[PDB]
Amino acid sequence: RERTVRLQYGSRVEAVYVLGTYLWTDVYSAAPAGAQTFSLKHSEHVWVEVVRDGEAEEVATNGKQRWLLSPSTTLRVTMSQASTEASSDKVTVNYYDEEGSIPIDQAGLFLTAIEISLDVDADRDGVVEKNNPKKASWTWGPEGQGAILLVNCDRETPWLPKEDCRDEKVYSKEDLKDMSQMILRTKGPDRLPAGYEIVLYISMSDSDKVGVFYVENPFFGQRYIHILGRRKLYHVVKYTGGSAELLFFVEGLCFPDEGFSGLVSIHVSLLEYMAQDIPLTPIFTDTVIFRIAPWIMTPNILPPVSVFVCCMKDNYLFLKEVKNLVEKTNCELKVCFDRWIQDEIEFGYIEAPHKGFPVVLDSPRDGNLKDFPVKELLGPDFGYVTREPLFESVTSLDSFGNLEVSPPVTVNGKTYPLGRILIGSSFPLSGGRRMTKVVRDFLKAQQVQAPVELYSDWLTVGHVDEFMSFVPIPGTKKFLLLMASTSACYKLFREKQKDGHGEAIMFKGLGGMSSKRITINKILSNESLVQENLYFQRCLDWNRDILKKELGLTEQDIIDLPALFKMDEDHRARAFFPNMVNMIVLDKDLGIPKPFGPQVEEECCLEMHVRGLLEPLGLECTFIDDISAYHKFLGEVHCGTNVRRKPFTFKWWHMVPSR
Amino acid sequence: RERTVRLQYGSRVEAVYVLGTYLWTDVYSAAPAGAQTFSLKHSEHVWVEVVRDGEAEEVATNGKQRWLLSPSTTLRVTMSQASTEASSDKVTVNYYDEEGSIPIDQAGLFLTAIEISLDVDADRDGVVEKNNPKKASWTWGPEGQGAILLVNCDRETPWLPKEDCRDEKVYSKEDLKDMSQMILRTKGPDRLPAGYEIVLYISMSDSDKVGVFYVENPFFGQRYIHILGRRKLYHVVKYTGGSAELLFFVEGLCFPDEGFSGLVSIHVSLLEYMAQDIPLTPIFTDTVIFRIAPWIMTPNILPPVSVFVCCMKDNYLFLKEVKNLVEKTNCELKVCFDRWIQDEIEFGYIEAPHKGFPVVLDSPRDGNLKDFPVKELLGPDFGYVTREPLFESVTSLDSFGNLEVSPPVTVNGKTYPLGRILIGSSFPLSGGRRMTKVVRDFLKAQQVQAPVELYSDWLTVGHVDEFMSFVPIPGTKKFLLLMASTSACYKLFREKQKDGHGEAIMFKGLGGMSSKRITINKILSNESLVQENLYFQRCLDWNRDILKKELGLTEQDIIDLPALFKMDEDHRARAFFPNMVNMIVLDKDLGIPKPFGPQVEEECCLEMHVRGLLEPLGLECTFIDDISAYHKFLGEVHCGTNVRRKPFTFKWWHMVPSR
């Protein structure tokens, strides 16, 4: 980095020299009129070259050499070490006229060299390296660089209702662990020369994306000073001499979103005071960039940590059977005394090289059913983020039973190491329901899960988790797509009828259904129901094809589970018997909603059929009864579950998302 | 592309097959309960494979072979050619039970194969190729692909005031030449089977970015039908049998900008009618993408075409001398009877493989000076674009004397083949003036000129063209940065004073300045003026350094022209004598504002000095007097010029801009 500094006619120039730059110095303008030649002296730690029309020559500290004065003959001045109090760093130029060897005048440049570097951990190893040359840019990939920042969206102490990043204050030092470190490293003499100051700053635009704190240790305890952030765009730094470091802590306030890429910048400048009423001149500027870490979703193949369950206190069978299931595993069971846990929240995570933690996305509230956000999960290293439609009204498709994510896949040679987010929608020309733009824009902005829209709008509730799920294949690295299938159910019922079981009864033991006496015969004979379910099978197959295309799946990767639906006035489907596809997946152990299918030899033929599909693959099935407490099934489920999982081993910043 | 089609239990399925896909076909669900095995027949142009648990085997048109019925034994069905009226394309499956070889039932699939492809010129050669496999994506670079669209911002006929793209109508067929072609190619029998239609569509979001027209040739003349665009999101296509093509013409309505990347999409779907009140099912969808071409600026090194000049009718010397200058060249001179031509307009261009033309950017109006846009240049193949601040108020920095562009440069190994846009600004912490966000966002969004902000706010008017310009070096591929320099002027004046010329007078022949009797002595003795100009030289040098850094320039690339300024109450500079740096550059021929400097031996010493710098490089200097008609110079110029240049040879789409 070359910087222009002119000797001044007749007088002397004093300048700060910042290490890592060099000066090109005009000696001609300061020369008296009529002067012919010049000579120079310089001090030990100042390197000086005479550059004549591009050709550079090193010059001794005290030589007698003379050069012709020319506008194209200049000096290049370099220093390799900071000034100390013992320094006198200078270059002096003497001018001579035609006759005589005694100087007729002199001009000089007195220098104070300092080091100024704003440093961050751009190599993503957790420690802050000295002046990474790539620190001012951010590149994706295994070879990529630039520093990473977490949205500090958890809450360190319960005494306040709001996530840590909602204010300009820091209370507990634990908060600092969520933050990225930025160090201003300087070296120099006891003080900066008169007329200089060092200033940290950010743009107005980034002022709502970050906050930056400095830790002071005064007499009565540690304190946290907010030096940049909301309503603070700059901070004048107190300079200390010798070799010094100022440690700062940086928090992100905002996730990537529509209109915000996730990149923010922080600057330090050495400023020179010119005079009153005139702006200070930036002499030197150093810049670091941060990318705010995206919100990432966990597919069913990732190790389970905690099973969150919501049901009424008296649904005993459900609780007993869920507890049993979870006891087969190392997961914690958490119970709250009823679909909200599945529909209103999605457990994601965020990760930076230094730190990571789970973060809840809270579903938008309509004002009818959900008038209030659920913030009660907000805690230490458990974060919160939400999006609220300003104009667009919320529908059932905004619920998070409509939000899922695939396992890692490769499609046409493109790798999606974090899987792909899946959300249900309607056909483009349909005028049907679609998840709100604000939420779709959010998921898209995270970029690393490259969302795909499926077709869920043929379902009354309209959730992808009504028709599909993923399960790992035990003892392998592979997984299966599970699809609800009405054709499988009809095939099975028709076989059992042929077998003499046509009078086999469904919903056995549900007292509220008994008067209906629904048998296999009654189902197979219902002609309109057959046509409705053929149509629903077309809707399922349309999704099957999208999933095969966008996830790179073949028929080998798919298992069909018998399902059956009834159609409403809108020509949308609701479950005829509980949807088995929407199941609790804890590795090889699967909690599957109990179907209450036709009994053949005192076993549910749906249960036996599902066991016959899954068990050969090493999957262990537990059927979970959530409906008996209600005595009947009308197509709605009254319980919900959500599994919080360990994050991917693969680091999101190693991905290379499409431009 | 695999697509799911199930045989239906007991009945027959009729389907359209779109070429380029293939069907996976479930034969198991349609089999009666109890059936054991199946066999199949198929027609000549239907290829059928039996796939058993992943293993595929080709099957003859009429064999007797039988396979076990299994959910994992399916068919894969392919066709390589479209159906005609002579086609009966079918697959028939027969089912058999345990005992006996006579079929107990059959299910069949009757097929109509058609070709549907939406085609664009994605290989950027100007002709529309058949089904480019990359047509659905857009990639930068010499190896890149995807189709390009012009904003159709010119005006074909004068009878309407507005640019062509402001409406939904097309009047003259000449308009079509500005448009990109998109062809829907189909092949098939006389009609689509019952229950199908083909539909073109766009998203609501793109509906204000494009319009799409179809040309009809009815009895009374050619007409232009607007089928997609504003308030039209879809169009049902009239299908014609045999091998057919529908030619469409696509126009862009909008340049890339903040919030619009420039990419738009157009879709065609084959839709299947399910029943009343139910949405149609997209069966097949094909997509093409367009990128709208950015607005690009031309640097001084590009060949001049037309010199636009604005001055009062009676400034005769100016007109005579500009005419003389232009006569040395092949350029057209266009005169309008006064800075607006330089300040209110920037001549850019747009280019697509098929077409290109110049486009004027019109400076934002404040409501004080400019209350009205200048649309009078809008014409055939001369386009118009403007940006209006909604909130932010316009300042002098919004004028286009503050908007320039560098010649092509390479910086730290990164190539900028189109050069870089340069706009003047203030220091970040200064609270000074800055070009409006809306215009800055626009230039940034064009992406291919990667704009750089310089520091212009030390100048009263605040324009980069007050202090710097570029000129080519004749007989080479290189160029020079020209910088105003106060130090050069003081050096020169001090030499002439030493030489005995201190009483040499400036502004000689300007009657309104005569009483001031400004001499070299008077200038050099003015102490406060010296200090002001030392400060202005610091402002110039700060820019010099930015330019060297961001353009990859060395001192070898720069020539300093003597300049001098006076300071106002705001501590901002205005020219003491006309700024010579802001000059008309027509290749080797340079119109330079006449400085009216001190006369030495009856020649202006500023003119002789400038000739001595430039002439050795093969540059020919003509000094142009725009001030004599005014009898005095107060720091304002009353004439303006703008040179319209040929576009770069390098195609913008061959660039690879940073992510």
Ligand SMILES: [Ca+2]
């Ligand atoms: Ca590091």
Ligand SMILES: [Ca+2]
């Ligand atoms: Ca806080």
Ligand SMILES: [Ca+2]
């Ligand atoms: Ca925290």
Ligand SMILES: [Ca+2]
């Ligand atoms: Ca924490």
Ligand SMILES: [Ca+2]
């Ligand atoms: Ca979910």
Ligand SMILES: [Ca+2]
């Ligand atoms: Ca082509």
Ligand SMILES: [Ca+2]
């Ligand atoms: Ca039009």
Ligand SMILES: [Ca+2]
């Ligand atoms: Ca046109």
Ligand SMILES: [Ca+2]
């Ligand atoms: Ca035209």
Ligand SMILES: [Ca+2]
């Ligand atoms: Ca301009």
